[PDB]
Amino acid sequence: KRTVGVPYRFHVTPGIFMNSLVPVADNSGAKLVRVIGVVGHYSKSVHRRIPGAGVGDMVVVVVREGKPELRKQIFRAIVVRQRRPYRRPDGTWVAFEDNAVVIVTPEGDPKGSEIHGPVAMEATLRWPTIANLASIVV
Amino acid sequence: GLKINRPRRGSMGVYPRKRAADIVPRVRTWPEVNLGKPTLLGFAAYKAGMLHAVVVDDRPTSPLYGKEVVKAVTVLDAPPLYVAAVRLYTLDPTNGYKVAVGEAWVSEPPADLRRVLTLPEKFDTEKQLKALEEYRDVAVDVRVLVATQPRLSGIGKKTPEVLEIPVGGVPSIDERINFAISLLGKTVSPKDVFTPGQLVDVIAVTKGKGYQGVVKRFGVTILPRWHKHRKGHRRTGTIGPQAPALMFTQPRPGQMGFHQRTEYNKRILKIGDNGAEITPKSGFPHYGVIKGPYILLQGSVPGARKRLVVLRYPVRPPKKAPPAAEPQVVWVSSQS
Amino acid sequence: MKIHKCSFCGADIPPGYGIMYVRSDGTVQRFCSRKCFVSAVKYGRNPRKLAWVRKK
RNA sequence: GACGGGGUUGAUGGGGGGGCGGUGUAACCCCCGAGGGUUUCCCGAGGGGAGAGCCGGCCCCUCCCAAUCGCCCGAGCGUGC
RNA sequence: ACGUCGUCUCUUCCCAUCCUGGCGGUGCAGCAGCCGCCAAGGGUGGGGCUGCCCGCCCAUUAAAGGGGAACGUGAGAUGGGUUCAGACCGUCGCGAGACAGGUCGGUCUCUACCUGUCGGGGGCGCUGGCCGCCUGAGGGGAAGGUGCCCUCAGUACGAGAGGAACGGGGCGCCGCGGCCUCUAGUGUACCGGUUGUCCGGCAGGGCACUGCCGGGCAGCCACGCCGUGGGGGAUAACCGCUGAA
RNA sequence: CUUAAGGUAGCCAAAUGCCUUGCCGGGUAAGUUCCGGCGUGCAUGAAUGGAUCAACGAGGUCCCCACUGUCCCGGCCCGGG
RNA sequence: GUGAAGCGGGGCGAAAGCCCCGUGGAGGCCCGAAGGGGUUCUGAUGUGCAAAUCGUUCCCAUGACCUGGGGCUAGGGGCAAA
Ligand SMILES: [Mg+2]
Ligand SMILES: [Mg+2]
Ligand SMILES: [Mg+2]
Ligand SMILES: [Mg+2]
Ligand SMILES: [Mg+2]
Ligand SMILES: [Mg+2]
Ligand SMILES: [Mg+2]
Ligand SMILES: [Mg+2]
Ligand SMILES: [Mg+2]
Ligand SMILES: [Mg+2]
Ligand SMILES: [Mg+2]
Ligand SMILES: [Mg+2]
Ligand SMILES: [Mg+2]
Ligand SMILES: [Mg+2]
Ligand SMILES: [Mg+2]
Ligand SMILES: [Mg+2]
Ligand SMILES: [Mg+2]
Ligand SMILES: [Mg+2]
Ligand SMILES: [Mg+2]
Ligand SMILES: [Mg+2]
Ligand SMILES: [Mg+2]
Ligand SMILES: [Mg+2]
Ligand SMILES: [Mg+2]
Ligand SMILES: [Mg+2]
Ligand SMILES: [Mg+2]
Ligand SMILES: [Mg+2]
Ligand SMILES: [Mg+2]
Ligand SMILES: [Mg+2]
Ligand SMILES: [Mg+2]
Ligand SMILES: [Mg+2]
Ligand SMILES: [Mg+2]
Ligand SMILES: [Mg+2]
Ligand SMILES: [Mg+2]
Ligand SMILES: [Zn+2]
């Protein structure tokens, strides 16, 4: 069996939504992706509500800018940075300078071999494979 | 039916959304609690304001266990309640209704009670207690009539609020009666009723908002692509089918707020004796200062910033009780 | 219950106040208020040039 | 409309003093100022020091002013089963 | 003279049940699947294409059921299509013209009288008047619904590949009810900067419909925070005990 | 042979193709529209004008960047009702 | 604002010529007030300010341009960039 992340996912104000364009924070080849789905027990919405995701959530993305052989391909990614301020369960308010995702396999293993920039602690706690490559954790 | 499924807009469990009949909450349900000693099953206090506190999480299974977390808290200004009368209840054999059989008053009620009550110059308490004792063997419930002491609060008004609070804690009706009679003419402080760290239910009339439209009152959507719609956008499209006609479940504008609501399982974080340690140096905005005892509740409470709020023992407590030890409030935002 | 300093005006930030801002380069900045956050980030102001920071 | 609080045995609104807060450092005065001229005692955008200044549909304290004078509603009696 | 398609908005009802609850069969080892029965409390969503409806498709999902209400709802909206007058094409017609073939354009009227519904008031009655505290006939409720992770356990099962469950622990999403401490929005209270002009200059100010720009208390508010449960009774489909005819 | 001839150059699922969301490419995560090709073309074609887009367009349409309260999802404020 | 014909200078060059800069002031030319028109919001109004209006956004704006006064054409007739 594989290393387990934390069982919990506290409420986070979502930062990205369907058809958001988000930069990629790894060296997997993709540079810019379009968000086309949210995965998990928190993806369900209500009439007219557009599904959204926050740091630590897994999303479905399409590579828009990047290497020619990845263009128009559908992948899974984890949100690691978010401009939308969010409140941690201990009461701390956090915001990043930019949005960012990391391309992973459906089981949560990153495709690239390095992650650029700081990574939200929500992402590293839920996905231990991301924690392994995150140089800076906030 | 609907073209696309979605839940209805707003609850019909609070129908009709009328103004509360009284500004003082009227509690319908009082729990049966086994404390080992007789005690009042509730308390009344004035909502003063809100702060936030650094509290150490004491839930051993919680992911935040042992950490310092920031929690929004509500401050209640809680001067002692004055016990004015004892009332006994029985069950009417015709229908099983609970019916008052008599009550005994203090001989010399405080002058402020005369602002609300038509009282004699003196109550002959001993005769009333004697008459009350005749109904002891058919008694099923005993309650005290308490008056607030708003002069001791930050509001500073003089007219008190009067309400009944039952006596519980032990299953024996006789000891509850004896305890209630011993309270006649005495005051009850919050520490006599509750212990820090326990859960309580809170009942109050919520903040008033006047006449409000259907968008705010029920959460109906503003008509999408708002500028397109002649005759406005803050509305429902239709107000019903052809049959049945306007039903009572159709969202309509009307009074919003000033309703009585009950919230459950609010933790008492601290019961202080002197409110100067919790009052901000600026005072509580739109309230004033707290000089006597206070209650620090975790979370929010219904009502405006001077509303009288009733706390009672919980009627839907969770399976696992909170830790026995008092919670550790490291710091409150009204302090340096 | 650990007190930080505003990254712009230098004041103490009591618990439960302000925001923690993470720069693109990974530097963590704390601001006591929206006034200090927009001054430091959005509008690029110089704290030494602001009298209310100098005389604080 | 209503509801709630106060009404001199009174802190109900205002005023005055204090607290807390917003903005950003007024006036006056002193120093620096690219350079030019009645040559270095004048002009000059601006920078610095001390002082902030203005303001509060919030909190406290204090009877200084006003919660006055007044106008109304109100059961009371019979009869039968 | 009953406003002609669809969609929007909003409410309710049906069950011939897609998921959620219960049970059974299986050509049910496990993981899955298939089939039947009870059950309508709750859920049934987001997009691409087309005027659509329907349908096909994309990524999710517990699942993304179907119907009725004057083909619910235009004195509520919208007006893309259809279905007026202008025009083009193809075809038909000697012709003027025609086509439910395609195409571009093409006024959506009304101060609400009654009733209904939602909220807000005045009175009379309640067996003389009044004050305060209570009771609870009945009425309303979805006030809650539903997922995921860890453990169980790489265990049962299985030749292997694969691979559960009960119980225990943690947390969301959707809905409902509150609240304003934090953060976010606003904030024509307030403070400051600054453009043009006018008041002789400085200072102070008018106007540029806050002149514009920045900050912002209170209040309001959500993008923020808090609460939102188990149980008992009789039952349904049925499964059993004892038990004769 | 039939009322003479028998659709040439071209052009096309056309504002002209019913079948039909025609078939194959482009563009989208997904394109009944659009673009590029294909053509025994229900029923295209030469002053009945064919082909043809430089310039021009309050003509009809598709795509891309920017942009945003159109929307997610609603909130607060201003003037008049 | 653009900058036609025409007219200067300079540069390259064997000739022709080509290039740069200027001058010049053409056009049912362009942006845009007045003026003229009447596209959108399918905005307001829709017992109206009005038996056709108002706001906004627009089109033309040296010309087949807009406009005053005078004159001609009359009903099976006129007049029609239809
Ligand atoms: Mg309209
Ligand atoms: Mg008729
Ligand atoms: Mg009708
Ligand atoms: Mg009619
Ligand atoms: Mg059935
Ligand atoms: Mg209909
Ligand atoms: Mg209509
Ligand atoms: Mg109708
Ligand atoms: Mg149309
Ligand atoms: Mg049309
Ligand atoms: Mg037509
Ligand atoms: Mg013909
Ligand atoms: Mg009307
Ligand atoms: Mg009921
Ligand atoms: Mg809410
Ligand atoms: Mg502002
Ligand atoms: Mg000046
Ligand atoms: Mg003037
Ligand atoms: Mg002005
Ligand atoms: Mg041919
Ligand atoms: Mg052509
Ligand atoms: Mg063809
Ligand atoms: Mg076409
Ligand atoms: Mg032909
Ligand atoms: Mg032709
Ligand atoms: Mg022809
Ligand atoms: Mg031609
Ligand atoms: Mg033209
Ligand atoms: Mg022109
Ligand atoms: Mg129109
Ligand atoms: Mg209109
Ligand atoms: Mg009208
Ligand atoms: Mg022009
Ligand atoms: Zn600061």
The 3-state secondary structure of B201-258, one letter per residue: EEEEECCEEEEECHHHHHCCCCCCCHHHCCCCCCCCCCCCCCCCCCCCCCCCCEEEEC
Cross-strand bridge partners of residue C29: C21
B232 nearest nt, CA–C1': E77
For A36, A118, A123, the CA distances from A22, given in Å and listed in that order, are: 11, 16, 16
Secondary structure letter of residue C43 according to DSSP? S
| C36: exposed, middle or buried (Cβ count in 10 Å: 0-12, 13-18, 19+) | buried
For A121, B39, B295, the CA distances from B189, given in Å and listed in that order, are: 46, 11, 11
Q: B97: Cβ under 7 Å from strand F? A: no
What distance in Å separates the CA atoms of residue A93 and residue B216, rounded to the nearest whole number? 28
Name the pairing type of β-strands A52-53 and A74-81: unpaired
What 3-state class would DSSP assign to B334? coil
What distance in Å separates the CA atoms of residue C18 and residue C13, rounded to the nearest whole number? 7
What 3-state class would DSSP assign to B26? coil
Q: How many CB atoms lie within 10 A of CB C5?
A: 12
What distance in Å separates the CA atoms of residue A56 and residue A40, rounded to the nearest whole number? 11
Q: How many CB atoms lie within 10 A of CB B107?
A: 15
What 3-state class would DSSP assign to B312? strand
Report the greatest alpha carbon distance in chain A. Answer: 44
Residue in B44, B229, B9 with CA at minimum distance from that of residue B152: B44
Residues with CB under 5 A from ligand 34 (ion): C 6, 8-9, 32, 36
How much distance in Å is there from the Cα of B291 to the middle of ligand 3? Answer: 67
Q: What is the 3-state secondary structure (H, E, C) of chain A?
A: CCCCCCCCCCCCCCCEECCCEEEECECCCEEEEEEEEEECCCCCCCCCCCCEECCCCEEEEEEEEECCCCCCCEEEEEEEECCCCEECCCCCEEEECCCEEEEECCCCCECCCCECCEECHHHHHHCHHHHHHCCEEC
Distance of B233 CA from E117 C1′ (whole Å): 20
Secondary structure letter of residue B185 according to DSSP? T
**Locate tokens 């364009």: which residue?**
A21
Cross-strand bridge partners of residue B44: B310
Which candidate from C21, C24, C26 shows the least CB-CB separation from A95?
A: C21
DSSP string, B261-282: EEEEEEEEEEEES-GGGTS-TT
Q: Is the Cβ–Cβ distance between B270 and B301 less than 8 Å?
A: no
Residues in chain C with CB shorter than 8 Å from the CB of B330 are 1
Residue in B48, B66, B13, B90 with CA at minimum distance from that of residue B328: B66
Residue in A43, A45, A41, A48 with CA at minimum distance from that of residue A8: A41
Deposited resolution, Å = 2.0
DSSP string, B44-67: EEEEEEEEEEEEE---TTSTTTTS
Distance of B178 CA from E239 C1′ (whole Å): 55
Q: Which residues in 46-105 of chain A line strand F, with CB less than 7 A from it?
A: 46, 48-50, 52, 62, 64, 72, 74
What distance in Å separates the CA atoms of residue B207 and residue B257, rounded to the nearest whole number? 6
Q: Is the Cβ–Cβ distance between C14 and A88 less than 8 Å?
A: no
What distance in Å separates the CA atoms of residue B71 and residue B57, rounded to the nearest whole number? 10
Q: Is the Cβ–Cβ distance between A43 and A26 less than 8 Å?
A: no
Structure tokens, A104: 């992973």
In the annotated binding site of C for Zn(2+), the residues are 6, 9, 32, 36
Structure tokens, A59: 């999303």
Q: Is the Cβ–Cβ distance between A99 and C27 less than 8 Å?
A: no
Distance of A15 CA from G67 C1′ (whole Å): 63
Which amino acid is located at C21 in the chain? Y
What distance in Å separates the CA atoms of residue B180 and residue B172, rounded to the nearest whole number? 13
Give the neighbours of chain B: at least 3 Cβ pairs within 8 Å. Answer: A, C
C34 CB contacts (<8 Å, ≥6 apart)? none
Q: Is the Cβ–Cβ distance between C41 and C47 less than 8 Å?
A: no
Cross-strand bridge partners of residue B255: B211
Q: Is the Cβ–Cβ distance between A103 and A80 less than 8 Å?
A: no
| A16: exposed, middle or buried (Cβ count in 10 Å: 0-12, 13-18, 19+) | buried
Residue in A89, A112, A91 with CA at minimum distance from that of residue A102: A112
What 3-state class would DSSP assign to B174? helix
- Radius of gyration over alpha carbons of chain C, in Å? 11
* Positive or negative: CA dihedral B212, B221, A55, A2: positive
**Locate tokens 């935002």: which residue?**
B333
- Residue B148 region, left (φ>0) first, then alpha (ψ -120 to 50), else beta? beta
Residues in chain B with CB shorter than 8 Å from the CB of A47 are 4-6
Name the pairing type of β-strands A93-96 and C19-22: parallel
Ramachandran angles phi, psi of B197, nearest 5°: 95, -10
For A90, B253, C22, the CA distances from A120, given in Å and listed in that order, are: 15, 45, 10
What 3-state class would DSSP assign to B308? strand
Residue in C41, C43, C32 with CA at minimum distance from that of residue C9: C32
Give the neighbours of chain C: at least 3 Cβ pairs within 8 Å. Answer: A, B
For B55, B270, B331, the CA distances from B324, given in Å and listed in that order, are: 16, 14, 21
* Positive or negative: CA dihedral B46, B49, B55, B57: positive
Q: Is the Cβ–Cβ distance between B86 and B145 less than 8 Å?
A: yes
Q: Is the Cβ–Cβ distance between A52 and A14 less than 8 Å?
A: yes
Residue in A102, A55, A112, A96 with CA at minimum distance from that of residue A76: A102
Structure tokens, B38: 């007789």
Nearest chain C residue to A89 by CA: give it.
C16
For A38, B25, B69, B205, B284, the CA distances from B208, given in Å and listed in that order, are: 40, 14, 32, 9, 20
Beta strands in B36-189 (DSSP E): 39-40, 42-56, 68-77, 81-91, 98-105, 141-147, 162-168, 187-188
Smallest CA–CA distance, residue B325 to chain A, in Å, is 21
How much distance in Å is there from the Cα of B245 to the middle of ligand 4? Answer: 19
Structure tokens, B95: 């229908």
Which amino acid is located at A45 in the chain? S
Q: Is the Cβ–Cβ distance between B333 and C16 less than 8 Å?
A: yes
* Positive or negative: CA dihedral A68, A71, A75, A79: positive
